[PDB]
Design a protein around this ligand. Structure first.
Ligand SMILES: [Cl-]
Ligand SMILES: [Mg+2]
Ligand SMILES: [Mg+2]
Ligand SMILES: [Mg+2]
Ligand SMILES: [Mg+2]
Lengths: 195, 241, 244, 204, 196, 243, 231, 226, 250
């Protein structure tokens, strides 16, 4: 799929993902949720080749849910991101690789810190204050480089995110039909239903 | 008492199947002898054709393993030929892989390692044979190396195998105690064969015709067996002195 | 055919016991005693070497206490050669986990993995089980200091203090008597050595007949240190506690 | 398309009097797009230091692989691995993937704990060892680094003088490469102390 | 390459040039293309030097193992073992081999095995890049039951012309004579055969 | 004791009792023979007529391998068929690689090694047959006989089955009275006689005679069955000698 | 005794007891008869029921248009062997455009049964078969034993009380071989033959099973009211 | 790369230059191209540098085990046979071009090996990008019955031709002499005709020239006691 | 065919004994005596060449074997089992170490690999244990000189000095009285010869005794010169003459 954004503020991680799904000529859907909850305090958004994206995301989800039951314990965002990276790093030298890029937003309950990880289909992992995949960063990073502060509130993070989406809606040729926004904090995962 | 059926240890630390394989070795009731000259290695063995319906030319316990290596076997013919085919295959593969002719002692070690495996692995039985390998090695010269069902092997100055091995062994021991050298000091292989036959006659106390013996000779770059008429010429020379 | 010679190592008795597991446990009962004691500020591992010689090179010798990683160690009771097979497998598992998750393996996860391997040899394959019992001493940030044991059946359990090997009945009674929950490492060191001193089949307990190890947060600030005691250091702690 | 220049980056190592130095930039990118300014390329296993340039996924994978292997080495050997031995392990590990290689340019640096001798080495993506006395270079600005090192380097430099030489070699090489920069780190390594210094440089 | 084998009254003679090329560079000017797979069974090699060496080494192994079990192999048998390797691995091989041998029962025999892996028994055979230039000469000048001296001259004159016109061929002319008398090696230098 | 319960187990004598028990099955079978003549070999076998309901000349026992080797056996008939099937695979692969038809001594060892292999493990049973076989190759005529142990030798004459002692004695007379040799046509006649004489050990039921031969002059070195007039001539010669 | 635990063990007298025990299963089975002339070949089989509510177990199986058999012993083993025959008949037709010779079919069955008598782990087949067929050399009848022994015959019978039918055929040999071009009379002889093996019970409409193959007659099985004509 | 091999009276000598390149860039100025297969069997390699070392060490390792198994000193023909069969199996993909030389109980030997598995025998040989320059010298000055001193001279002269005339070759000359009944003498940097001249200027910086953001001590020691 | 013995032939008995391992140790007890002594600057291993026949050339049978240039081995028990273990030990030193790290393994780790092979023959399907006990002497840079014993069970122990086989009990007592931590290599060789004389019945000379040392580097045995860091093997087998010279000062 197309645009996926992420921003880590003071006490939460915010992920924004486009709603459009395009089958070449036509837009088949304009309400698609490009994300999966891996654990109560860990969310993963994704974008890449059709089919592979959901197949990969659900496979990861199943594995983390299996771990949670076996140990009666939630893995840290860092631990989840490493597991995901290894799967993609394994995938890139397979017969047919997963063509999937992901953002992992999680709140570490031990350290009481939000964390945002950016991983591409090759298995290239980086921890960032804000990140993106595809052409999304080309339009948004200049705004984020200017306005971002590490002590931002969740409301300030959403406002900076709106400015990013407005710039995308102005200068991008494709109509991505807006974004679904989700927040990850100490209380878990919730969706902002008006954006 | 299943420790006597397969190759596992008995309470005394013994392998009975290996010991019983040594007993099968003497089932043919044939005695063999091997000696070294200056330029050659000679091996002789008794030949017994009890049935008149047999083709005597096909009855043999001496094998041409490679051009340079010869092998005499003490034990039943099926196990003998099993070992012969394998040795031939090993010698050929060695030459292909390493670019030179397999030495006599190295082949002996290889076949001894294979025998060792049968004493340790339960599904394989030992072969009831003793293998005596002979050649004129390009590095070590005249060579005699002998393998048994236990997986044991060693080089020899001279050696004997069969029911009456002890009598032949002591006869050879006494000769080398006199001469104080590790071989038969003789130029031609013909006279070394004559030495071998003479000392077998002395040890066993029996006379031999041309059809009662079987002879193999190793020289530089070839091993060959003698015909009945070649042996007859050897027997005539012995009788004339 | 081959069926004739098969001992059938993985069958139940009429009473519902696994013959080979039971007999392996009988083997372990003749091995040198190993003791583990867990305290609030650390864990102690003490173990007795079996009837040694004066010509044995002790300072380079290891038959009881093995390091699995920087946070986890084991005490062995049984066939040493069997234990080393399992120990190497456990060391690899810890490294696999570290590579996958970029975090040190939790103690119980390592213990469960080794115990599952032991279990397999009792249910399938027709091979004899491993004649080994382990005491696992370890630390992680979830449960803190932990003591476990596993035996040839593949069953494992957690402990505050535990013994394996010879005279476990006598040893466990002595530990049950003197152990308290607010105990410290230095007190646990003394209890472990006193227990071995009374349960030993030898005439006296000396430095050359012992292996000793501690896992302490007595490492400079929030971190854990493993200490495999040297022969001279075992000799000193024996004098300090008043056994020699 | 070329895997060795997708992410960009550089590593350089030098020897001095009773010391070694190893340094790297901090950039990770997706071709033209700069993605991270905190992507360190130098790792250490005990007292042995390893720098890795090239495809970033393989940089991460190999670090995790050599951590794995040096940890098992230490448990069995009961001692930390030495630079000479580790060099052979890197070479072996790379060559086992001869026909499906990791797209990397590793650099080893360290001091042998027993002899005290300074040691550096470099590799191509498939295992060939380049063990130079003077310096080793790697990455997308290796040509530039060869030029700086060849003129700036002299033998038997003291630790604090060696720091200046390797720092100037890296900085000026990185500024002539589009895919290198965005910060830099320099390790000065002596027999029983190691100092790590982050450098101030242009951020374009 | 220029190679040939010719049967005559007393047996068979193999002939070859000594040039090995990598493009226009002569990588070896004194190559031995006449190769022994058994005492009196030899072959001539053309095509990939790697392929023909690998094949000849395998055939030598097969015939050594044959000899240990069944005694001396026939020339036909040797040709069959060559064919089996060339035919079954035709997709991966570039080899053109001439097999020549002497039995006492069959006397001198020649078998040629081209690229495809087919076998052809012939009175004489020519092969290699240089052979194209002497099809006319050889067809006009070959006779059956020639003497040793006549056969040596036929091969010498033939390969001389092949060398003269083919840039890929050159160096010395090697020959191997196979008869009941034994195995004789011959060599002829440029100053000799160029003035013919 | 218990050494005879499993194959490949050496007894304290150094004997394989299972192989010796396989010989008992061979000794229980019908008589079969082989005669080596001047330029070839002749094979013959006794076929017991269990009932009138057996179709004459249909249940053929002698088997061909390649086109130049004949095989006959006594004991468990299915075991013999299994051995011949292997022999045919061995002969096919030999001709595939080496072009020439398999020599008889070469073929003999292929069967020998295969039979010997069934004495090495307790997971297999030894062969319950002794096989007489041979033919013509480049070096002339060859006759072999192969036992359950894997043991084989070359023979001038060979016999196996229930009437082997009788047959052997008759073969020994032929060797003594013909040092210069026996012709192919003579050997067919003699083979018929020997089977008829050996039938005294199986005198309860009547039998059917079956003969085959390979000869350089008479069959061009190919294996063929003796049929029609030549078979009847041999039966008449045999019947005349017993009376 | 000590030598009947598996098929891989000879007894001291050279016997294979597991094979002999498999032969015993055939003797417990219901009687079936086979006989032929020069033009036709016939199978007659007495089917056995479990009780009065049960059906009568089928005894005859078709293998091709020109070949088929009757069974006596373990029925599942007959299904395995007949399936193998169906495949071999079929391989011959597809690859060589050739109907499989009855004699060659016997050779294939012999070899398949033999492998189960020389290897550890397996067991011998517990069924006997009577194969009839018409090929390029006319009519044929074969008898298969699970020892591996296959025999070509004019007539035979296997199963319980089969000796009575076998003696009858041995007397009638000269008569029934001459019944050429008359299928009904050849079946009559087969029905009269199997009657020499009956005790207490007689041939009823759902008891009798008949099969025939010949010159211009594909292998066909008759059951039910189709055999009332011959009762 | 330039590598040569030359036979002489009582043995054989091999030589090589010391330049290894990444395209037009010199990666190492003092590379070691003379590899040891066994004590008295040495080989020089051209082509893919990892392949020539990898294939040399594998065969060298197997040769050592073979020597222990047979209780005999290794032979050059064994190294040759094992090398060509390995290289033939990989159909040229292992880019190793070798000159193999040595002494053994059979005598002194000199062979060359191509990446596809073809081998050849000679009294003088050359391989690599500078092989044509080297072979020109060898074809001009080689004769039968060379002495040890004459062979070392000829071999090094052939490498020099490669050094000066081939851009793929440079720096120093390495030599290894293998004489019958003697220890093999490895002469590292036998010639050094390419030392760099003193620079015009010193480029040692004043201390404090580089701008620094942060300093910190790196903990290379293990977790401490107490 | 196929190996249908996929089950363990060594199993625990009701008393907790592993019968086949105990019986393997009994075989070792019947074997000829061998010993090892560690000095400050070296290690010595020794045994008797019990010749089966005087016609046999006992030089062609090597009881003391080189495993690596700095590691050697001797045994007591079944000779053929020892020979195949030496083959496997030599190969594993390369495959699991030298081809990875570019150097020979330290003594303790090679011993560990040999032990693993011996343990597996105690648990794997269709095999018996090895009927030998090994004594392995060696040197490496970081551990110095060391001496190890390996048993049929796979267990191994480090020793200052020890003996195995026929007269081991008496030999170990003899070594306890003579061994100290200040022994030079020549003193250890002297003690080894004294100890071994007690268990030998017949001839006692250089031709009936096999003895090797792990000592100083031997550049004369390297086979080549030119690499300063390569200084030669520390393993050296003493000649027949060298043994006899030390039997005069006995
Ligand atoms: Cl071996
Ligand atoms: Mg066995
Ligand atoms: Mg830049
Ligand atoms: Mg920029
Ligand atoms: Mg030309």
């Amino acid at each position: 799929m197309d645009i996926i954004l992420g921003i880590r503020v003071q006490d939460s991680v915010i992920l924004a993902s486009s709603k459009a799904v395009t089958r070449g000529i036509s837009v088949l859907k304009d309400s698609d949720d490009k994300t999966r909850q891996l654990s109560p305090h860990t969310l993963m958004s994704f974008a890449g080749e059709a089919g592979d994206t959901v197949q990969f995301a659900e496979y990861i989800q199943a594995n983390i849910q299996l771990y949670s039951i076996r140990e009666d314990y939630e893995l840290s965002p860092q631990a989840v991101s490493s597991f995901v990276r290894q799967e993609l790093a394994k995938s890139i030298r397979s017969r047919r690789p997963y063509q999937v890029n992901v953002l992992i937003g999680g709140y570490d309950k031990k350290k009481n810190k939000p964390e945002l990880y950016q991983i591409d289909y090759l298995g290239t992992k980086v921890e960032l204050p804000y990140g993106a995949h595809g052409y999304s960063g080309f339009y948004t990073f200049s705004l984020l480089d200017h306005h971002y502060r590490p002590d931002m509130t969740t409301e300030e993070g959403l406002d900076l995110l709106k400015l990013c989406v407005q710039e995308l809606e102005k200068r991008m040729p494709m109509d991505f039909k807006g974004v679904i926004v989700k927040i990850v904090d100490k209380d878990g995962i919730r969706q902002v239903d008006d954006f | 008492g299943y420790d006597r059926h397969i190759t596992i240890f008995s309470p005394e630390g013994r392998l009975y199947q290996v010991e019983y394989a040594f007993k099968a070795t003497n089932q043919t009731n044939i005695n063999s002898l091997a000696v070294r000259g200056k330029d050659c290695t000679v091996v002789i063995s008794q030949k017994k054709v009890p049935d008149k319906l047999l083709d005597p030319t096909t009855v043999s316990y001496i094998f041409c393993i490679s051009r340079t290596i010869g092998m005499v076997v003490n034990g039943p013919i099926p196990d003998a030929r099993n070992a012969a085919l394998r040795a031939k295959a090993e010698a050929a593969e060695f030459r292909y892989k390493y670019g030179y002719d397999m030495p006599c002692d190295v082949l002996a070690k290889r076949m001894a390692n294979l025998s060792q495996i049968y004493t340790q692995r339960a599904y394989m039985r030992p072969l009831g044979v003793i293998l005596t390998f002979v050649s004129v090695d390009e590095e070590l010269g005249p060579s005699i190396y002998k393998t048994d069902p236990a997986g044991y092997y060693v080089g020899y100055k001279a050696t004997a195998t069969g029911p009456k091995q002890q009598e032949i062994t002591t006869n050879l021991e006494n000769h080398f105690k006199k001469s104080k050298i590790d071989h038969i000091n003789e130029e031609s292989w013909e006279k070394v064969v004559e030495f071998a036959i003479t000392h077998m006659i002395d040890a066993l106390g029996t006379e031999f015709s041309k059809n009662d013996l079987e002879v193999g000779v190793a020289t530089k770059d070839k091993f060959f067996t003698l015909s009945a008429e070649n042996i007859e010429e050897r027997l005539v020379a012995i009788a004339e002195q | 055919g081959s069926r004739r010679y098969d001992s059938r190592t993985t069958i139940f008795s009429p009473e519902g016991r696994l013959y080979q597991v039971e007999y392996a446990l009988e083997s372990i009962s003749h091995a040198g005693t190993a003791i583990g004691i867990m305290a609030s500020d650390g864990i102690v591992l003490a173990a007795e070497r079996k009837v040694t010689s004066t010509l044995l090179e002790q300072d380079t010798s290891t038959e009881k206490l093995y390091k699995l990683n920087d946070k986890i160690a084991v005490a062995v009771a049984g066939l040493t050669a069997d234990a080393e097979i399992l120990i190497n497998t456990a060391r690899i598992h810890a490294q696999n986990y570290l590579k996958t998750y970029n975090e040190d393996i939790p103690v119980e996860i390592l213990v469960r993995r080794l115990s599952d391997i032991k279990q397999g040899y009792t249910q399938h394959g027709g091979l004899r089980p491993f004649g080994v019992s382990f005491i696992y001493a370890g630390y992680d940030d979830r449960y803190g200091y932990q003591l476990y044991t596993s035996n040839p059946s593949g069953n494992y359990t957690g402990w505050k203090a535990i013994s394996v090997g010879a005279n476990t009945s006598a040893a466990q009674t002595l530990l049950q008597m003197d152990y308290k929950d607010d105990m410290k490492v230095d007190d646990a060191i003394e209890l472990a050595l006193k227990t071995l001193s009374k349960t030993t089949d030898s005439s006296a307990l000396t430095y050359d007949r012992l292996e000793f190890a501690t896992i302490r947060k007595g490492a400079n600030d929030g971190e854990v240190y493993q200490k495999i005691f040297k022969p001279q250091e075992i000799k000193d702690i024996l004098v300090k506690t008043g056994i020699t | 398309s070329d895997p060795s220049s997708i992410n960009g980056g550089i590593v350089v190592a030098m020897t001095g009097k009773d010391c070694v130095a190893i340094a790297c930039d901090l950039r990770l990118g997706s071709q033209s797009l700069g993605v991270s300014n905190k992507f360190e390329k130098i790792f250490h296993y005990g007292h042995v230091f390893l720098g890795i340039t090239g495809l970033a996924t393989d940089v991460t994978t190999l670090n995790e692989m050599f951590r794995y292997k040096t940890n098992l080495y230490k448990l069995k050997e009961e001692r930390a691995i030495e630079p000479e031995t580790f060099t052979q392990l890197v070479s072996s590990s790379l060559y086992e993937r001869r026909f499906g290689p990791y797209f990397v340019g590793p650099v080893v640096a360290g001091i042998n704990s027993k002899s005290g001798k300074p040691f550096i080495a470099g590799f191509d993506l498939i295992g060939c060892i380049d063990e130079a006395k003077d310096f080793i270079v790697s990455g997308t600005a290796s040509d530039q680094l060869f030029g700086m090192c060849e003129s700036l380097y002299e033998p038997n430099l003291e630790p604090e003088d060696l720091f200046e030489t390797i720092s100037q070699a890296l900085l000026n090489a990185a500024d002539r490469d589009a895919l290198s920069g965005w910060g830099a780190v320099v390790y000065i390594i002596k027999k029983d102390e190691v100092v790590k210094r982050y450098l101030k440089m242009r951020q374009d | 390459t220029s190679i040939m084998a010719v049967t005559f009254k007393d047996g068979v003679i193999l002939g070859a040039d000594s040039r090995t090329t990598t493009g226009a560079y002569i990588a070896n000017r004194v190559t031995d293309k006449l190769t022994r797979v058994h005492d009196k069974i030899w072959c001539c090699r053309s095509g990939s030097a790697a392929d023909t060496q690998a094949i000849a080494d395998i055939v030598q192994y097969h015939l050594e193992l044959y000899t240990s079990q069944y005694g001396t192999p026939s020339t036909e048998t040797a040709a069959s073992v060559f064919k089996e390797l060339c035919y079954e691995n035709k997709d991966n091989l570039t080899a053109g081999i001439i097999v020549a041998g002497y039995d006492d029962k069959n006397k001198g025999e020649v078998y040629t095995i081209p690229l495809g892996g087919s076998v052809h028994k012939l009175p004489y055979a020519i092969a290699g890049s240089g052979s194209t230039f002497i099809y006319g000469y050889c067809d006009k000048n070959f006779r059956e039951n020639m003497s040793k001296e006549e056969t040596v001259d036929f091969i010498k004159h033939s390969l001389s012309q092949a060398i003269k016109w083919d840039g890929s061929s050159g160096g010395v002319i090697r020959m191997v004579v196979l008869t009941a008398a034994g195995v004789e090696r011959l060599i002829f230098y440029p100053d000799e055969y160029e003035q013919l | 004791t218990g050494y005879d319960l499993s194959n490949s187990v050496f007894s304290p004598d150094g004997r394989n009792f299972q192989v010796e028990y396989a010989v008992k099955a061979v000794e229980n079978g019908t008589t079969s023979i082989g005669i080596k003549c001047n330029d070839g070999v002749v094979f013959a076998v006794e076929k017991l007529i269990t009932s009138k309901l057996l179709v004459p000349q249909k249940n053929v026992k002698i088997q061909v391998v390649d086109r130049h080797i004949g095989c006959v056996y006594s004991g468990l008939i299915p075991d013999g068929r299994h051995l011949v099937n292997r022999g045919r695979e061995e002969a096919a692969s030999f001709k595939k690689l080496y072009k020439t038809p398999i020599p008889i001594p070469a073929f003999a060892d292929r069967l020998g090694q295969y039979v010997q292999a069934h004495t090495l493990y307790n997971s297999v049973r030894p062969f319950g047959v002794s096989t007489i076989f041979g033919g013509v190759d480049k070096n002339g005529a060859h006759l072999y006989m192969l036992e359950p142990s894997g043991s084989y030798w070359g023979y001038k004459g060979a016999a196996t089955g229930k009437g082997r002692q009788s047959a052997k004695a008759e073969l020994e007379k032929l060797v003594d009275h013909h040092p210069e040799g026996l012709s192919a046509r003579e050997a067919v006649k003699q083979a018929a006689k020997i089977i008829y004489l050996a039938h005294e050990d199986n005198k309860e039921k009547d039998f059917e005679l079956e003969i085959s031969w390979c000869s350089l002059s008479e069959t061009n070195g190919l294996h063929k069955f003796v049929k029609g007039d030549l078979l009847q001539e041999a039966i008449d010669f045999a019947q005349k000698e017993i009376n | 005794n000590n030598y009947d635990g598996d098929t891989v063990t000879f007894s001291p007298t050279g016997r294979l007891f597991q094979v002999e025990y498999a032969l015993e299963a055939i003797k417990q089975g219901s009687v079936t008869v086979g006989l032929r002339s020069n033009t036709h070949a016939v199978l007659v089989a007495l089917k056995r029921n479990a009780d009065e509510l049960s059906s009568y177990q089928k005894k005859i199986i078709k293998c091709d248009e020109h070949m088929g058999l009757s069974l006596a012993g373990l029925a599942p083993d007959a299904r395995v062997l007949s399936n193998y025959l169906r495949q071999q008949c079929n391989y011959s037709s597809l690859v060589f455009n050739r109907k499989l010779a009855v004699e060659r079919a016997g050779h294939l069955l012999c070899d398949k049964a033999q492998k189960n008598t020389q290897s550890y782990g397996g067991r011998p087949y517990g069924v006997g078969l009577l194969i009839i067929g018409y090929d390029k050399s006319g009519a044929h009848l074969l008898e298969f034993q699970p020892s591996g022994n296959v025999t070509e015959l004019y007539g035979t019978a296997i199963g319980a009380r089969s000796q009575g039918a076998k003696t009858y055929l041995e007397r009638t040999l000269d008569t029934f071989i001459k019944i050429d071009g008359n299928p009904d009379e050849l079946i009559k002889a087969g029905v009269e033959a199997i009657s020499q093996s009956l005790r207490d019970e007689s041939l009823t409409v759902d008891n009798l099973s008949i099969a025939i193959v010949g010159k211009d007659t594909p292998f066909t099985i008759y059951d039910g009211e189709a055999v009332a004509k011959y009762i | 790369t330039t590598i040569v091999g030359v036979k002489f009276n009582n043995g054989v000598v091999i030589a090589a230059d010391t330049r290894s390149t990444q395209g037009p860039i010199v990666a190492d100025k003092n590379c070691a191209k003379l590899h040891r297969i066994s004590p008295k069997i040495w080989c020089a390699g051209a082509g893919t540098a990892a392949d020539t070392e990898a294939v040399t060490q594998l065969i060298g390792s197997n040769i050592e085990l073979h020597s222990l198994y047979t209780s005999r000193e290794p032979r050059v023909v064994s190294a040759l046979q094992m090398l060509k069969q390995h290289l033939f199996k990989y159909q040229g993909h292992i880019g190793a071009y070798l000159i193999v030389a040595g002494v053994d109980p059979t005598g002194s030997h000199l062979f060359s090996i191509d990446a596809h598995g073809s081998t050849d025998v000679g009294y003088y040989l050359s391989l690599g990008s500078g092989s044509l320059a080297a072979m020109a010298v060898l074809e001009s000055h080689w004769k039968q019955d060379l002495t040890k001193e004459e062979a070392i001279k000829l071999a090094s002269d052939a490498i020099q031709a490669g050094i000066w005339n081939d851009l793929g070759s440079g720096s120093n000359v390495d030599v290894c002499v293998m004489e019958i009944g003697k220890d093999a003498e490895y002469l590292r940097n036998y010639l050094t005709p390419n030392v760099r001249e003193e620079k015009q200027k010193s480029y040692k910086f004043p201390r404090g020239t580089t701008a620094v953001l942060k300093e910190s001590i790196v903990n290379i020691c293990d977790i401490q006691e107490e | 065919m196929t190996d249908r013995y996929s089950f363990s032939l060594t199993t625990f008995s009701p008393s907790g004994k592993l019968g086949q391992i105990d019986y393997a140790l009994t075989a070792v007890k019947q074997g000829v005596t061998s010993l090892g002594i560690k000095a400050t600057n070296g290690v010595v291993i020794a045994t008797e060449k019990k010749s089966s026949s005087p016609l046999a050339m006992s030089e062609t049978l090597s009881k003391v074997s080189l495993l690596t240039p700095d590691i050697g081995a001797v045994y007591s028990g079944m000779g053929p089992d020892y020979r195949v273990l030496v083959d496997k030990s030599r190969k594993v030193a390369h495959t699991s170490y030298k081809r990875i790290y570019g150097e020979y393994p330290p003594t303790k780790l090679l011993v560990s690999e040999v032990a693993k092979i011996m343990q597996e023959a105690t648990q794997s399907g269709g095999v018996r244990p090895f009927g030998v006990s090994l004594l392995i002497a060696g040197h490496d840079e970081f551990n110095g000189f060391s001496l190890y014993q390996v048993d049929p069970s796979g267990s191994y122990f480090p020793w200052k000095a020890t003996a195995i086989g026929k007269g081991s009990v008496a030999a170990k007592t003899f070594l306890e009285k003579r061994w100290n931590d200040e022994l030079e290599l020549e003193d250890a060789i002297h003690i080894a010869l004294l100890t071994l004389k007690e268990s030998v019945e017949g001839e006692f000379n250089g031709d009936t005794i096999e003895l090797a040392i792990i000592g100083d580097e031997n550049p004369d045995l390297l086979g080549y010169t030119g690499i300063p860091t390569d200084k030669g093997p520390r393993f050296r087998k003493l000649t027949s003459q060298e043994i006899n010279d030390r039997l005069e000062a006995l």
